[PDB]
Design an enzyme around this catalytic site. Structure first.
Site, PDB file in Angstrom:
ATOM      1  N   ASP A 133       0.825  -1.202   0.000  1.00 24.51           N
ATOM      2  CA  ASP A 133       0.000   0.000   0.000  1.00 24.51           C
ATOM      3  C   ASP A 133       0.862   1.257   0.000  1.00 24.51           C
ATOM      4  O   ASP A 133       1.948   1.266  -0.595  1.00 24.51           O
ATOM      5  CB  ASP A 133      -0.946  -0.048   1.211  1.00 24.51           C
ATOM      6  CG  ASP A 133      -2.278   0.608   0.947  1.00 24.51           C
ATOM      7  OD1 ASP A 133      -2.300   1.856   0.878  1.00 24.51           O
ATOM      8  OD2 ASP A 133      -3.296  -0.104   0.810  1.00 24.51           O
ATOM      9  N   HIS A 163      -3.839   5.979   3.760  1.00 31.49           N
ATOM     10  CA  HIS A 163      -4.579   4.802   3.312  1.00 31.49           C
ATOM     11  C   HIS A 163      -3.951   3.507   3.830  1.00 31.49           C
ATOM     12  O   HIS A 163      -4.644   2.649   4.395  1.00 31.49           O
ATOM     13  CB  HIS A 163      -4.657   4.847   1.786  1.00 31.49           C
ATOM     14  CG  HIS A 163      -5.445   3.744   1.160  1.00 31.49           C
ATOM     15  ND1 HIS A 163      -4.865   2.559   0.765  1.00 31.49           N
ATOM     16  CD2 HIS A 163      -6.744   3.675   0.784  1.00 31.49           C
ATOM     17  CE1 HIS A 163      -5.781   1.794   0.199  1.00 31.49           C
ATOM     18  NE2 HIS A 163      -6.931   2.444   0.203  1.00 31.49           N
ATOM     19  N   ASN A 180     -14.013  -0.337  -6.498  1.00 29.47           N
ATOM     20  CA  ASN A 180     -15.039   0.599  -6.043  1.00 29.47           C
ATOM     21  C   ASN A 180     -15.827   1.218  -7.194  1.00 29.47           C
ATOM     22  O   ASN A 180     -16.233   2.379  -7.120  1.00 29.47           O
ATOM     23  CB  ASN A 180     -14.428   1.712  -5.193  1.00 29.47           C
ATOM     24  CG  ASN A 180     -13.659   1.188  -4.006  1.00 29.47           C
ATOM     25  OD1 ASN A 180     -14.010   0.167  -3.425  1.00 29.47           O
ATOM     26  ND2 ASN A 180     -12.599   1.897  -3.632  1.00 29.47           N
ATOM     27  N   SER A 204     -11.142  -1.240  -0.168  1.00 27.53           N
ATOM     28  CA  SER A 204      -9.860  -1.177   0.528  1.00 27.53           C
ATOM     29  C   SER A 204      -9.991  -1.447   2.013  1.00 27.53           C
ATOM     30  O   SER A 204      -9.016  -1.861   2.644  1.00 27.53           O
ATOM     31  CB  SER A 204      -9.239   0.210   0.394  1.00 27.53           C
ATOM     32  OG  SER A 204      -8.737   0.460  -0.899  1.00 27.53           O
TER      33      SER A 204
END
Length: 279
Positions: A39, A69, A161, A224
């Site tokens: 990430d 994130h 998404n 996520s």
């Protein structure tokens, strides 16, 4: 063990019903397992990680998470308050820059890095990788995820998404990894969650409270956020000896809460991750 006033998603993964707020789990808590969070990095100094998180690799000028994130995802895997597997070891691999973007070539390198780097770590109960990232279909990205899985790592990836069929996204569309859709606190498919036959499981993904950079916390939404619930669950179940890296996705689907989600398109699994813990 019981954690009162837990984030709804933790409570959900240990419950046969929505609408409760205590998370129940075996005290082993993923001890002896390892989860790689591939990430934007991890703010390992966050008190919530208790010294159990570290950066092991970056492809950029810093290993620090300048975005948040990756820290949020890592918190859902394994932070003391916000995490599924509260005693796992967390390893950060920074393949995404501080804007949250990354080239597929860097992402592939990061996956092959984990497949090798696990041999440099002590993970007697097993190894998981959480990939809350993706883009358009790429056979090379899918192949990298497949290699990582084949090497003995439980790979959990975000479905995406786009409110679309995940077959058109990578690594979501790789059959051999665990592709994770998102649900909300009322057991509805999250409005943005991708769907399709390639999904293996749903996890909590709407309004998920976790760690953030600057020693903070916040609630955000996405596939996520669902992915690290599943990654942490896998680490927890592997520590319990109930499954292995190669079999954990199938075991999670076997033991999931079935048929309880709304707005699941025909042809997509109606399966919600569940730890089956009996206090």
């Amino acid at each position: 063990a019981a954690q009162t006033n837990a984030p709804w998603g933790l409570a959900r993964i240990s419950s046969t019903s929505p609408g409760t707020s205590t998370y129940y789990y075996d005290e082993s808590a993923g001890q002896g397992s390892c989860v790689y969070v591939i990430d934007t990095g991890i703010e390992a100094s966050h008190p919530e990680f208790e010294g159990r998180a570290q950066m092991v690799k970056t492809y950029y000028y810093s290993s620090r998470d300048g975005n948040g994130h990756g820290t949020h995802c890592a918190g859902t895997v394994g932070s003391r308050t916000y995490g599924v597997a509260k005693k796992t070891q967390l390893f950060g691999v920074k393949v995404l820059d501080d804007n949250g973007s990354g080239q597929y070539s860097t992402i592939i390198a990061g996956m092959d890095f984990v497949a090798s780097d696990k041999n440099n770590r002590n993970c007697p109960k097993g190894v998981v990788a959480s990939l809350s990232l993706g883009g358009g279909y790429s056979s090379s990205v899918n192949s990298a995820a497949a290699r990582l899985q084949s090497s003995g790592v439980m790979v959990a990836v975000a479905a995406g998404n786009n409110n679309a069929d995940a077959r058109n996204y990578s690594p979501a569309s790789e059959p051999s990894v665990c592709t994770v859709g998102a649900s909300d606190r009322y057991d509805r498919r999250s409005s943005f969650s991708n769907y399709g036959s390639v999904l293996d499981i749903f996890g909590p993904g709407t309004d998920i409270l976790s760690t953030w950079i600057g020693g903070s916390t916040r609630s955000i939404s996405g596939t996520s956020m669902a992915t690290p619930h599943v990654a942490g669950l896998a680490a927890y179940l592997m520590t319990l000896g109930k499954t292995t890296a190669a079999s954990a996705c199938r075991y999670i689907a076997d033991t999931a809460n079935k048929g309880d989600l709304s707005n699941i398109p025909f042809g997509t699994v109606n399966l919600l991750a569940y730890n089956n813990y009996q206090a």
